[PDB]
Each structure stands twice: as C-alpha cells, then as structure tokens.
Amino acid sequence: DVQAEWSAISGLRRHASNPEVKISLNRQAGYFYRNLIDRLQKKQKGADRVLLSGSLLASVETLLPGEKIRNGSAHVAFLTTSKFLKGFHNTRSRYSPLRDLSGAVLIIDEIDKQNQVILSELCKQQAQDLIWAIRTLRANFRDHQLESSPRYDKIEDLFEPL
Amino acid sequence: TYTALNFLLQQMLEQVRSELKENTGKKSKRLLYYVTDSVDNVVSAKADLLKLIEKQTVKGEPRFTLEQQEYLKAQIVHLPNQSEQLLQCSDAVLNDVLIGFNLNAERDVQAEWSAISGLRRHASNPEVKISLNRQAGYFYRNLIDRLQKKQKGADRVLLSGSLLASVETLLPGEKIRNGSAHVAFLTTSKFLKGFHNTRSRYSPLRDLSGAVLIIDEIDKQNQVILSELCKQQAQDLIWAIRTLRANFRDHQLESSPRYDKIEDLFEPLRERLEEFGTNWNLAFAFNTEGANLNERPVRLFSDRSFTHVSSATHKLSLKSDFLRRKNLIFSDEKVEGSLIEKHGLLTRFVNEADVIYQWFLGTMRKAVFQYWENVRGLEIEVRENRSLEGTFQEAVQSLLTHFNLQEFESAVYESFDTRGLRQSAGGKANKLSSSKSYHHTGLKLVEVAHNQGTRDTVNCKASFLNTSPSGVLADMVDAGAVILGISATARADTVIHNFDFKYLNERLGNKLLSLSREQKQRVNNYYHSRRNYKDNGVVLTVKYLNSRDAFLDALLEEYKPEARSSHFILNHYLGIAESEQAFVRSWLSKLLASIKAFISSPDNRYMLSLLNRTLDTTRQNINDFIQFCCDKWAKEFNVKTKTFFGVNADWMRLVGYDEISKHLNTELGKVVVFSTYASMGAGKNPDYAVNLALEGESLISVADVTYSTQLRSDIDSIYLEKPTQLLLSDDYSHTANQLCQFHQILSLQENGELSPKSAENWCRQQLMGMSRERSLQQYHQTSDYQSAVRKYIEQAVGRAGRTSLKRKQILLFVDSGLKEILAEESRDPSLFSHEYVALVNKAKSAGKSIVEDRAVRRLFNLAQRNNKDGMLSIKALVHRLHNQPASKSDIQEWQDIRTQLLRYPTVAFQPERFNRLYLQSMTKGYYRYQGNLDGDPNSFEFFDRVPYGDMVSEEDCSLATLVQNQYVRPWFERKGFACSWQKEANVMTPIMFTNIYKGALGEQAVEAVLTAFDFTFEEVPNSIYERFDNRVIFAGIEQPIWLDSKYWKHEGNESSEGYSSKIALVEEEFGPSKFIYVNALGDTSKPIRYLNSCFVETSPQLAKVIEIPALIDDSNADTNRTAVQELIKWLHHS
Amino acid sequence: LEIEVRENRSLEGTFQEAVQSLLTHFNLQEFESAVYESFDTRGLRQSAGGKANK
Amino acid sequence: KNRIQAIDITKESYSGFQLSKVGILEQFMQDLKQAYGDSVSVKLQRIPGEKHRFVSDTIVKNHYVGLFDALKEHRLVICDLTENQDTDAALTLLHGIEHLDINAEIAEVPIRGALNILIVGNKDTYKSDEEDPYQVYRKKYQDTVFQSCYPERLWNRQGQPNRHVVEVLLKELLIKLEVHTRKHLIEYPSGPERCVYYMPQRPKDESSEVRDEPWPVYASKLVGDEWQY
DNA sequence: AGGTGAGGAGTC
DNA sequence: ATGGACTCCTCACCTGCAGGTTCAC
DNA sequence: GTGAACCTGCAGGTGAGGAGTCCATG
DNA sequence: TGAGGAGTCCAT
C-alpha cells in the first residue's frame, strides 16, 4: 500500500503550481498521514520496539513534533483551541492534554469567543441506539466473570449494583 | 471468432421471431454473455460483432436495411469498471443527474466534484493520471450510494426523457433491468463481483436459469477463480461462539403469516449452543501457562476428513480453574507416557467450534428462501413484484434485527443466495452415506496468539477454503446455464494448470457433451484444405542442441583478447559470481549456436527466440556480448542483420509492435527478436506485410483456393527453451500464498499422483517454514509436470503462423532437455498441428523407453487413500456413540453401512453415494494385502508387491457353509442378502471386511437359530448401545436378558477389567441381569462354560454368564440342539 | 506493588491497557469508541455537588 | 578470512589451473625471464627420500571397527541440562550412537560410575557466580568420566544429522577411559623404553602473561603394565 | 565446552 | 607518514563405484 | 570351479534457478 | 406579521 500511495503524492507535489492540484493534494495528504502513523504505532506497541538514535531520531522528531515533549526535550507548546480539545500524536499513542493538568500554565487570548468554539465541538457528536445497547448489556452481563488476581482486586465489587 | 459471433447473431434473431408471434402472454428476455480474462479482447470482440452486423450480404445484396441495423446495435452493452465508467461521461450528463436528484445543495458532493473536474482538465502527464483514477473510484461509490437510497421506498423521482439518457449513460446496468438490452460483454473478475443498477447491486451468479455463456481460453480461468477465493477474511472463534450463545437464549421471533416455518429451523442450533457452553466453561477467558508456550505462536492445520497437522512438540491440553476463574492451556506432562491426558484437547475445541460457526451461516439461506416463498403468494397485501433477487436485503435485515445479531451482516453477505455460492456442492455431507470429495469440502487453518494490548488473554484466528474452482464450474451447470468453452488445449491431463475432468465426469454425467469421430475427421479435412503441405514443397527441419563449452571458450577470448583465462573474463567483465556459472554457460552456448545456424542459411529473414527471462538493462553486460557475436557472423557470410532487445509487455504498449513489419517490408536484411513465454501471450498477431520486390522466390501459397485482402506472411525460424517454475504462487498476502500451496498438495493427493505418506510429509514441512526450491523438487517427481510442459510447447508453436503464405524451409531449434518428455507422447494425432507432429516424430526415433502407465500407479495410491479414511472415520463414529447421551442420526448411520454391505458386497459400476468403501482391484474378485489394523495407516501395501500377505476374497468368510443351514437361508433370501460374490472390479476395503462385515454377518445368524425355537428380540434403550448386541425376551422371564456375539471362533483380549466394567455398569442401573455369550461356525463338540461375574468359573447353577462354543458347525452346518436345550434350562426356574 | 516490566507509571500508560482488559473479559468490545470519547470531557465529573442529581 | 585453493584440475581444464596458488607461481617464473632474461633465476630444493609409506583405506576401516568393539562392553548415558529445554538432541544423538551397535540410555540426572555425555549451553551466557551445570556436576562426582557438547553442533547446514560429530565423541570417550583405568585396551605399538615423558603446562589464570614465569611440568611413565602419572 | 593442523587479521 | 616481527583469531575434512585379478576351499 | 576378499584410479558434487494483471476499497 | 449575513477550525 505504502509505496504506491506515496509515489502518487510525491509525483503530484512537483506540479503544485495551478490552483487545481492544491485542492486534491490537501485532501490526499491527510489520508496518507493517518495510515503511516498507525503502522508506526502498532509496530512499536511492545513486541519489536525499534530503537531510535541519531538520524532516525531526528527524522521522527521532524514528522512527529509531539514526541519531543515525551522524552523531555521541550516543555512549551503553541497551538489552537480545536487542536487543544482533541490532542496530538506521539510515537506510542494519542496524548490528550485534558487528562493531565496538575500544575501547568494556560494563557488564553480572546477568552470571550472560546465559548462558541467549545460549543461547536460539543455538538458534533454521534448518536446511539438505546434498545440495542440495553439488550446487549443485559445479555453479556448475565454470566460473564472477571479473574481473581491481585491486579483485579476490589474491581468486581464496583459492578455489583449494575 | 467468426463462428462464435455468428452463433450470437442467430440467437439475436430467434428472440425477435419469438416476440412477433406471442399479447397472448408475457415473459422476460434471455441474457447472453461473452466473458474472457483480458479487457482488450472484450473490446475487440464487440467491434467485430458490430462490423458483422453491418457488412453481411446474401445473394450479393445486403441482408438488412439501414433502419433494421439500428435496432440490432441498440441491444449490446459493455460494462467496464467504476473508474473507467466515470471518466467517459461528460459534464452535461453528470450535471443533469445532480440537478435531477437535488444533490447540489450538499457541500461534500460539490467539493469532491470540483476536485475531480479540475484534475480532469489538465490530465496530460502520467502523474495526475494515477491520482485521477483513485479519486474517481471513491467519488463513484459515494454518488451511487446516495442515488440508491433516494430511490428506495419514497421520493422516487420519475425517470423519462433526457434524464433517462443521462442515467443510462452513467449506469449501463440500468438498460437490462427495464428491458432495453439483453447482450453483455464483460471480463471474468467483474463477472464474479456484479454490477450496479438503480435499486441495488446485481449478482449474475444468483440467477442463471436459461442463459448462454461463451468463455474463451477456458483452461486459464482455473487460476483466476482461485485468486478470488484466497482474498477472504478471518474470524475469531471464541468471540463468535460467546456472541452466539448469549443471543440465542431469550430472543424470539414474531408470530405472523409472513414468518411461517422459520422458527423451527433454529431450534437444533439453540440446543447445541448450550451444550458447548457447559462442556467447555465458556463463562471464562483463555490464557496460556508455561514456558516455551509464550515464545512462539501455535498453528494448526485441518483438512476436515483425515489429514491433521500441528506445529507443537507435545500434545497440548485445556483446563478449568475455579479459583483463578480462568481456562488455561498447559503443556501437561512432556515426558514419555506418564498418565496420558484426561483433561481435554485444543484440537477438539477448534474442530467443534468450526462446525457450529458454519451451521449458523447455512441456516440463514434456508430461512431467506422460505421468507420469499411466504411473501410472494401468501400475503400479496402490498404489491412489490420482483423475485428472489429482489427480496434479498429485506429478509436478511428482518431476521438480524429480531435476533440482535448485527455484526454478522457482512459475513452473511459475502456467501449468500437461495443456498450457497461459496459453500460446498454435490453430496453436501461429510459422511460414509454421502459422496465425498475435496472439491466441495475445503480446508481450515487456525492460529492462536495474544490479544492486542492485553497481556492476559488469547484469541484464535481461522481461515477457510470451502470450494475448489471445479466445484463452482459444476454448480453453474446444475443451475441451468449453458457453457461453451473454446480452446486448443481444453482437455489437457493436468489438474494444476487445468480443471479436473474426472470429477466433472462423475458429477455431471450425460450433460458433458462431446464430439464424435466423424465430426473430428470433417474438421481435419477442413484444416488440411486451408493448410496443405504435401504439395507446393514445404519442409520442416528440426534440430536438438546440446551444451558446448569449447564453442563459448574461444568466443570469450576473442571478445577481450588482452585477458588471460575464460572464467576471469566471465566473472570480471560480465557480472556473474562463482555460484552462478554452470547454469549461465549452459544456456548461453545453445542460444549462440542457434543464432549461427540462422545467419548461415540464405533464404530466411525473421527469427524469434523464446526464453524464460527478460534480456533488459539489468543484463546489459550479456547483451553487448551477443551483439558483438552477430556482427562477426554477419561479416563471415554476406547478409546484414538487425536485433531487437527488451521486448516486454510494457515495451509493447509504449513503443509498439508495428516497427518490425515496417523494417521488413521497407529494407532488406535479417531480424532477430528476443522474447519470453509470457510476454508473447498478451501481444498477438506477429505478422508483417509482404513486398515481393524485396523478397525472393520462396513464397509458395498453400491454400487450395484463392485468398482475399492484403498479402501477409509470418515467422520462419523458432528457438525453444525449456520452461521454468511451474508451481503457482500468490502475491496478495501471506495467508493467501499458504492457502494456495495447501490447495495444490491436496489436489494432487485427490487425483492419485501422490501417496498419503508423501503428502503428509510435504504438509508438515510447509507448516514449519519451507523454501520454494524444495517444493519444486517435490513437484518434479510427478506425472503432471510433463503434461504441463507439453501444453506450453503446443501453445508456443500453435500461435506462430496465421497466414496461408509460407516459405519452403521452416527451421525449428529445440533445447536438449525436452527430448525424453516429447518422446513420451502417446495421444491420438488427429487434430494436431504440423510442427508438433514433426517434433514428436523426430524425438521418437532414438532408442526405446519403458513406459509405466499412470493407471497402474493410480490404483495403488487410491487404494491406500480409501483404506486410510475408513479407519479414522470409524473410530470417530464409535467414540461419538459412547458419550453418556446417544443421538439419533448416529444409530441410523451405524445401521446403513452394514445393511448396504450385506446387500451389495461387490458392485459393478462406480459407486456414487457409498464411494469410500470400495476399492478397484486389478483382478476381478479377490486381492491380497499385508498390514496392521491397529497401528499406522500409512504402512499398508497391496497387490503384487505383497504376494504372501492376507487375502480378501469370498472363501475367507465361509459364506458357502454359512448359508447352508436350514433356519438361516430363508432369512438371507427374503431381505435381499446376497449369498455370493459377483466377480466385478470393486471389493470392500480391508477395514470394512474385518470389523464390520464379520460381526454383522454372524450377529444376524444368531437371530435366526434362536428365533425359530421361541425367543424374542428387541432394541437397546439408548443407554448401553454398542456395549451389547441385543435384548431377548421369552415366556415372561424376569431379570432382563442381554446378549453379544463374536461371529466365528474369534478371540478378544478383554477378559481383563473391561468385561467386569461392562457387567458392573449394566448392573449398577438396570439391576440384576443375565448374559448370553455365544458363537457360531465353530466346533460343536466342546462343553458349555458357565462363567461367574469374574473369570473364575463356578458351578452351573450359580452363574451369571453362559458361554456356548458353537451352534452351527462348519462341517455341514448342523444345529446344536443340545446347546439350545441347555440354554433354555439355565434361563428357566433353575 | 506487583513488580514486573516497568515503564512510565501514570494514568496515560495504564489507560488503554485497563480499558482493553476490562472490555475483553466481559465480552462487549462494541463500546470501545464511546468509552474513548467520554473519558476526555465528561471524565472530570462526580464531585459530590459538581455532578449530582438530587 | 578469505582463501584460495591450492590446486585444481577439475575436468582437465587449463583455465582453472591458472587461478590457484600454484598457477600464479608458474606465471612468476615467466615474468622474471621477460624482464631480466637469464641473468636471474630461482632454483628449488628436493629433499632426499627413500622410505615412503602410502596408506590404504581398508586398514583405517578395520582399525575403527576394533575401536568400537571395546566401547561396546560398557554403559553409556546421555543427559540434558539446558535451561529452556528444546530440540530432540538426546534422541538424535542416541539414534546416531545406536546405528553403530552401541546401545545407550537417557537419564534426567547424571549417574555416578558410568560414562556420561552431557548437553550444555554456551559458557559465556551463565553468570560468573552462577553455578555452571558442567562445573557443579563435575566437582561433586570425582570418579567419573565426562564429555559435553553444545546442542547446535548435531545439525548440519541443510538440517540433516551430522555423523562425524558422533564418531568423534565416541573415540574421545574411549581415550579418557584408557587414561582412567591406567591400562591400555587396544593394541598400540611399542616405543623406546626407560624414558620419562614431561609436559609443561601454562597457568589458566588471566594474570599469567609473564613470559619467564615458571610453569608446572607433569610427568608420566610406564612400569610393568601400568602407567604412572 | 567435538578434535588436529594449516593459515589470514589486527598492533608494539 | 613507515617495516617486519610475535600472539590470538576463523575455517575445512572426515569420497564412491566400476572393472580386472586372485586366491580358498 | 567358483565366489568371497582384494586392489587401482576416473567421476561428480542440495534442492533448482520469472513475467504479468483485475477490481474494490477514504 | 415576524426579520433580513459573513467567517471559521479538523479529521476523514
């Protein structure tokens, strides 16, 4: 998959002069990026963790800037509201900044309009069928049980009333 | 092509003729197809059809008028892929369609369309072309999906006028649904996928009643279908079972007159799901426990009949821990022996999961057919019309919504119809009482590994093949379709490069039409009329070339005269290392030797060389060498030469193939072309226009009549090499390649070219990681290989020549590896070409070769295969008959086999239903074998190879003296039990002659002598079945009486704990019991043995088991009435 | 506790693995997207006054 | 390492004879002539010789048969001491041994008082203070003959069993047995008498890089029919 | 910790 | 930027059948 | 009279050894 | 009878 799709985009970038190839390139690049990073992540998800040093480290820090925060090279980030509410990728997973806020400093400019922006993000959320969900949960919770191990201690007692 | 297209035109006219006779009724139209494997061929055939309609005359005057021609040309449609379909419609059509359906208000559609059109306007260079194709596909998908949903049930816009023209241009498949056209042209790959109309996607393989199919190059298609069957998806077998068991406990259907007789089909499946739950504790997760089990994954391979392979070192086991609350896969005791496993087996879990999973996908099809039956005629409340092709998605969604199962939608959709299209064929059962074959059973591959993320759970992935290509081809005929396959090698004797015509002669029958001898001779006369060589003086010269090293040694020295040796020149200036030196020398010598002979001859101009590798830039160093040689040999004689390198399929469609003809009819000289076997299979018509000013006198015509149009000629010199790798391989993924290889191994085992021992070894090494070279080595020891090579030689020479103008000298040079193989040809030379006969005859004149006929080998191998399956199937059956509960299908299957063998111990023709019970012997009535029936099945040997082994024949059952008793013969004659062995070439296998025939033969002889003198027989109450023969009742006797038999004086070493266990188990529940052990056909002179509960023989009165030596003696078949009287005495007041 | 192969030990590392374990032992796995899209915005509730309906 | 063959006369070709270490030597003598004429020449020496004994193949074969006969009348045990047990090394080795009419057995722990062939792992892998299976099971049992091998040496490049290794292991076992019992078992020839054999021995300590540091020297001799060490 | 010999790489 | 001398390293071998002579009984 | 050892010196060695193409998927 | 328009992020 990779070589064919990459060759297409690489060829099309050279003739990027008319205001017609721009529209096609903009949409094509976004699709390519997702698949490439997904393959990278599942390759380094345990198993054969390929190490990074020298040239490879620099290249991956150019394609994934969000990695530089994880190792400890940079600690100052500039970004927008929409990207702040969603997150940025690293070499291992997607890092949501709304789960680790202890400490930190947040400078927000034009605090009034943020209200509208956030509201928009809340509206674009998928629906859910209720009959299907209730029947599924009812069927699967009748007989299934967890394990009895130290790592699963006092977790089962949180599900008894449900 | 002329004959086939004329055949099409005749049917086109018959439909019109029928239309004008029949208002007195109304029906539909007949669909005609023309499928092949290449796009170019489809387009060319369509063009020729139109030309034939225009330029056809009768009595020197047109057969049709101008206005009549338009009607005929308006009924032919061509169906390309989606990407090409979009790029032919202009902006006006698409704008009209978008406005008509009010899709311009949406933002996404308009944005996408803007991008597509913008790239379309600047599509010149081959960089935006690649992107344009990929974007066109996606846009087509989205547009069609929205159009379909808007036409579904409401807001159906009415189509008439210009809108109809726009839609029909964008969707050609519409023209068939309304009824405008009934002739289609398409490829094979698109034929297996379907095409689109306004409502939904149309699958041509779901309705084939009354359809004519014309297939060109029939033999090649075996590969194409296979590649489509290996691209399927995998499935987890733990999730599937736990999702089916949970949703089949409380969910119920509706009670309406449209759901009639559908809730009675899912009941047995519901019953089995719960048993599979309680037996394996499916309320817990799965995990491994131990070293060497968490390092490598575990792979299992099953053929579903007798072949099973595992990837571990010791048998694995399953446990259930009630304190850790989990199921553990442990390796158990890895030392030799030491308390053989009594917990469980992984293989059983996998095999039983599969049957249920495929039991759920076959019931749904039956349900949908029943739904259509009830909705078409028993409701008719809302008019909907349409047939089973229309009530397809509604009947699926209804059931799936009711059962809360919405994840199986895709898997149901891939294989679905009335019944099947990707699921079995023929007998449709894996049992002795059904016809069994590989082409409708398939194979299963399973892998066990850790789940993603979680470090405590494991999963089981499975991949399946359900039908061979031959089975699909046969089901198409049974549907009601007519298939016409045209080729020159359409009946080759290969199973890898062609279909299996033995399986098609046992399943089809008289539906496989064939030509007669008179017709064949008529065709032969026609061919000799159009190509006559025993006049005008045409001769064919053949020569075989061996390897010459001194020939190449001097040439290399002359190429670089300042070097020292030859190996140094070859290694340094050319680019081959020391490993690749012998093989290189071998081919290059022969190639150059042939070129010298071509150049020396005066009256030759054109030469084509067929190799197995491309001579391109990657081999530049070699190219120069060849070039140099030519120049030298051009100066030695007096003629100029020209050479053409790098002839690829890419080169053919980038530079063309019309340059050689131009250089041949404009300039004098000689031409040499380098090509391969596969390259000259997609580029056709290698002809050049002639010009008599340049050529000499050697253009003698061979046709008995004159010939029309321009004057053209062909090749007059050919070099033939020997083919290279002939084993198929896939490239889609890893699993696809694995499935391909297993398919081929099993096919060869099926036909009879491989023995079970070799096949099992090959499968095992495939599982552990194997190289291609070893696989080819295993392939080269079979008789199929030689057939493949001969097929390619035939095709290569057949395609060389298409005119009636030939020279007086045609030269054929052949490598020295094909001599023996060509000398082994033995078919009828009635429809052969002219060059092939010369090759065969030239090879056949050297010495002589002993020919061991393939039949003789096939008989031995097939005998082994049938005997092997019998043992395993019988063991599985009896084990399933010892489960605490006994089922009802099993007792039926147990009865049928014995009844069938008693009625027909030796059939004459080929059995159809009970096929893996009879073996074909060279002699007619008996055969000799030697082996062990309780050991390794892959150690047996039959026939002349064992001239001192045990015998299977009529004299060893003593059937003569068996039926000579007065109270036994009438019983045998009444129920049609044969008392003789008809001498035919089909006897029962050695597994069904000692453990089945013998028992059932004596068991029923008991029921005659005992029954004539009182006594009454009964049946086993489903709890002790196969642990005892029958139950006997007489004169109101208490303590219910059971008996058992051992036919003749046959002894079994079960006097140990086994007999005591049987007695104990019977008495623990049924209470006190009496046991009658008796034999027959033995010595009736021994006393009666009254054994106690143990084997400590007690007094006559205080005994529980009576043993009689014999009742019917073997001398002259008397009756031991003394034994019967004593038996009555013991089983009485006492 | 429970010494084993160790790496960054916080909410981030244990999040995905814990979700997959709990959603593999109880069957399900059709709810993965919902649980992933609710642990970002709604995840900071249950403050006994910040989120309670009584 | 890279190496070139000494001589090659395959298929009686003169091009292959020019690409060896004795084919270049022929060219060297033809280059001293075409630059110097006959002014400089190099002549080689022929060692005198009158006693030269060619050895046939039958004598070696008959020697090894009697070699194995003596080993037949004893006990042979195979044991496995790898950590992550894998491969059928014991089974393969036993098959190779039993093809020579020598019957052996498999044990889970080494037996005292019998010939032992042990299967061990790489020496570097085990830690310094880790108690090497080989060292441990040696020091405790001090009246027993021992042998060892790695499990990778019993399989060739193409996967077939390697016979040669099996013969070598058996012959070495017999040699140690001969040392232990102080009396020869097979017929060796006779040698000069009234002589004593001395062998210096380098210290195994890594500090023994001293050139002149004195070494222990070990002595052996024969009296009557018994060797004294 | 197969063996005995014959022989190509890396430094005071 | 140079030359020729010790010490430690890796790598290959461990044939096979066919035709003429000869005792050994 | 013959059939077992016995004694040179000519061959042959892991397997076998590559192009070309249809269609759906964001 | 009631009011009257442009400007934006990001992953598919």
TrEMBL record, chain A:
This is Helicase/UvrB N-terminal domain-containing protein. The chain holds residues 194 to 355 of 1220 of the full protein.
TrEMBL record, chain D:
It comes from the Bacteria. This is Uncharacterized protein. It comes from Vibrio cholerae.
